[PDB]
Amino acid sequence: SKVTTVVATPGQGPDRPQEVSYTDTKVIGNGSFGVVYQAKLCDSGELVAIKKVLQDKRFKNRELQIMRKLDHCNIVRLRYFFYSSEKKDEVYLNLVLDYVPETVYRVARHYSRAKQTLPVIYVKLYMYQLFRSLAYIHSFGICHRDIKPQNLLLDPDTAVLKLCDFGSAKQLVRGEPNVSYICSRYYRAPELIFGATDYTSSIDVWSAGCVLAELLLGQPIFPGDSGVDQLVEIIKVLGTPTREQIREMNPNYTFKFPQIKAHPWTKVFRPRTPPEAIALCSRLLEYTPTARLTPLEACAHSFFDELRDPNVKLPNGRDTPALFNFTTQELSSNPPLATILIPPHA
């Protein structure tokens, strides 16, 4: 019934605002983040998302500034943004984003409620796409700081994955400190749990490594409602961290801990799990942050060879989505991998 018309600046490109118009405005959800809507652009009939947060008098919005610098097919694209007015005599930023209809969390839960596990092909597609999006944003020095299944949108028909929510994202610089209260419960890296403030982008990776294990296992790998609990689940799997490992994570703590041996990664997963899946996990979920693979080194991992097979298709008969359209930016961390990341037939 209702057509809202606004004058919005576009996400990227030059600063030249246009008349955008939309209708069918539904709440998708709301939380600490503010409110997220769905709506339908009057022109294309194309669906979009609108994230509405209150705007600080004092400062320019961080999430906005980051979103404008980003363009990559595995990351929700900021189409437009505008300023408007639930709390009166005050100013709201509105980000108009790509709409993506599912989330990994919901899909994962669907498979779980049905006592089944996601087919490994879908794990392979999704994790690979997530590892690219990190590869990209990390190359700008930007850390997302809140990797978890809910922030992984999906189109079930096209198998495209898009990372979302940059509300916690920030650029890490060596020698600047950073607040250690930023990851979500099951996915925090140990350095964070221990309250370190000299952490690096390798936190985003430890999280992905949790998302992987979650998808293979059908339930969270390192659950717990307290730091202590999470830490005991971690030690159960990785074994007692050494002195050298603790210093690498957080110097101020080098507590004592329970002396537990490592339950070999092969004994952690269901029996017909692929060993490359396991192999990958073990290199992602490392105590020492510098020992963790980088996101690009992940994409080039064996687990992902099937995606580079020239005959791969989706179970529904369609082609796999863009997997190979790397840019110079994405590759800057380590350009030789192109020889493995871009396969003969692409």
- Residue 215 maps to which CATH number? 1.10.510.10
Question: Which residue range forms the structural domain that includes residue 250?
Answer: 102-346
Asked whether residue 208 falls in the same domain as residue 95, the answer is no
- The secondary element (H helix, E strand) that includes residue 3 is strand 3-10
The 3-state DSSP class for residue 83 equals strand
Which whole-number Å values give the CA distances from 302 to 131, 306, 307, in the listed order? 14, 8, 10
CA distance 109 to 152: 13
Name which of 232, 233, 229 is nearest 221 in CA terms: 233
Torsions phi, psi for 115 (to 5 deg):
40, 50
Q: Strands 34-41 and 152-155, how do they pair?
A: unpaired
Distance (Å, whole) CA 68 – CA 80: 9
* Known binding-site positions for ATP: 28-36, 51
Annotated binding site: 28-36, 51
Residue 333's Cβ-count burial label (10 Å; 0-12, 13-18, 19+) is middle
DSSP for 116-182, written as a single string:
----HHHHHHHHHHHHHHHHHHHHTTEE-----GGGEEEETTTTEEEE---SS-EE--TT----S--
Residue 238 within a domain? yes
CB 48 within 8 A of CB 97: yes
Task: Spell out where 11-91 has E strands.
Answer: 18-31, 34-41, 47-54, 78-84
Nearest by Cα to 255 from 336, 180, 171, 195:
195
- Residue 92 CB: number of other CB atoms within 10 A? 16
d(CA 226, CA 84): 39
Approach to solving = X-ray
Q: Do both 170 and 51 map to the same domain?
A: no
For residues 151 and 186, membership in a common domain is answered with yes
Residue 95 lies in a domain: yes
Integer angstrom CA distances of residue 120 from 169, 212, 274, 295, 332: 29, 11, 9, 19, 29
CA distance 83 to 276: 48
Distance in angstroms (rounded) separating the CA atoms of residues 266 and 282: 10
- Mind telling me the catalytic residues? 146
CATH of the domain at 67: 3.30.200.20
